[PDB]
Amino acid sequence: LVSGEGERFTVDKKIAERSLLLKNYLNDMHDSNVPNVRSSVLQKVIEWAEHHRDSNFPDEDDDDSRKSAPVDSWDREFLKVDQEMLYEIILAANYLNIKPLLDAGCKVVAEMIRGRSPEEIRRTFNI
């Protein structure tokens, strides 16, 4: 439920049910019956889940949605904190099968890389 490298957190909550992996691996259906994620990025993911605890997403049933839309500004600033850690945050959101964080991370990193091209550098950095 928490990374072994000194990682701990709330064992379960409405937030932890946000991860579709934990929808089955969090003792879900206990009557009928995390290792990989790095500690810091685990903290970051649970922070995002807690923040959006009071939100709703169309999940994979968004069809035309789930993409081709601007990302939430708070998510933009929250994820835009480290270039090297964003890829492993995307990987964590992938392993936990959490679609919204995956989509947000991909949007943010795509815009970072697009904005690092020399044309965009000159058009937005110095000009």
Partner 1 sequence: MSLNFLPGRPNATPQTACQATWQNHTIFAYCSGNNLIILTNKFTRLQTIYTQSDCTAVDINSQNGFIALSFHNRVLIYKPIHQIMQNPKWTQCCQLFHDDTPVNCLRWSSDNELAIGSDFLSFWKIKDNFGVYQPILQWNQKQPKPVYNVIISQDSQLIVSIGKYDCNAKLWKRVSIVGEQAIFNLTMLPHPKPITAMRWKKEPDQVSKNNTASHALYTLCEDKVLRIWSCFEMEKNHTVQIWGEVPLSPTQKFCVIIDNWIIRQTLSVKDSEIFDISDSDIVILGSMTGEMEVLALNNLSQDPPKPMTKKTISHKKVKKATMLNDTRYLYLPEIQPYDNVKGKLSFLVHDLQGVIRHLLIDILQLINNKTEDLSAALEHKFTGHNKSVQKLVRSSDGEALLTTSRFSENGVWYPQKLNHGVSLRLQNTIQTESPIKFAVVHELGKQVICLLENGALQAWECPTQKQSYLRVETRLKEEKKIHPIVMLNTPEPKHSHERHFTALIFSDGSIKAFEVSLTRGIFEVKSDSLDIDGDDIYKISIIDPVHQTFVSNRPLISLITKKGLTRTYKAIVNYNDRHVQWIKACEINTGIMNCTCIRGSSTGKLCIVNSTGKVMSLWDLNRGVLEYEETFHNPIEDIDWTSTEYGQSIVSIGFTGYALLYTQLRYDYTNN
Q: In the complex, which residues of this chain contact partner 1 (CB under 8 A)?
A: 81-84, 115-116, 121, 125
- As to burial, measured by CB atoms within 10 angstroms (0-12 exposed, 13-18 middle, 19+ buried), residue 19 is buried
What tokens does 58 get? 């169309």
Q: Considering beta carbons, is residue 25 or 87 the nearer one to partner 1?
A: 87
Q: Considering beta carbons, is residue 64 or 84 the nearer one to partner 1?
A: 84
Q: Considering beta carbons, is residue 12 or 82 the nearer one to partner 1?
A: 82
Provide, rounded to whole angstroms, the least separation between the CB of residue 3 and partner 1. 17
Provide, rounded to whole angstroms, the least separation between the CB of residue 99 and partner 1. 26
Provide, rounded to whole angstroms, the least separation between the CB of residue 8 and partner 1. 17
How far apart, in Å, are the Cα atoms of 12 and each of 86, 90, 111? 25, 22, 33
Q: Considering beta carbons, is residue 14 or 122 the nearer one to partner 1?
A: 122
Q: Which residues have a Cβ under 8 Å from the Cβ of 76 and sit 6 or more positions away? A: 104, 108
Provide, rounded to whole angstroms, the least separation between the CB of residue 55 and partner 1. 24
What values do phi and psi take at 117, rounded to 5? -65, 150
Q: Which residues have a Cβ under 8 Å from the Cβ of 2 and sit 6 or more positions away? A: 8, 9, 11, 34, 42
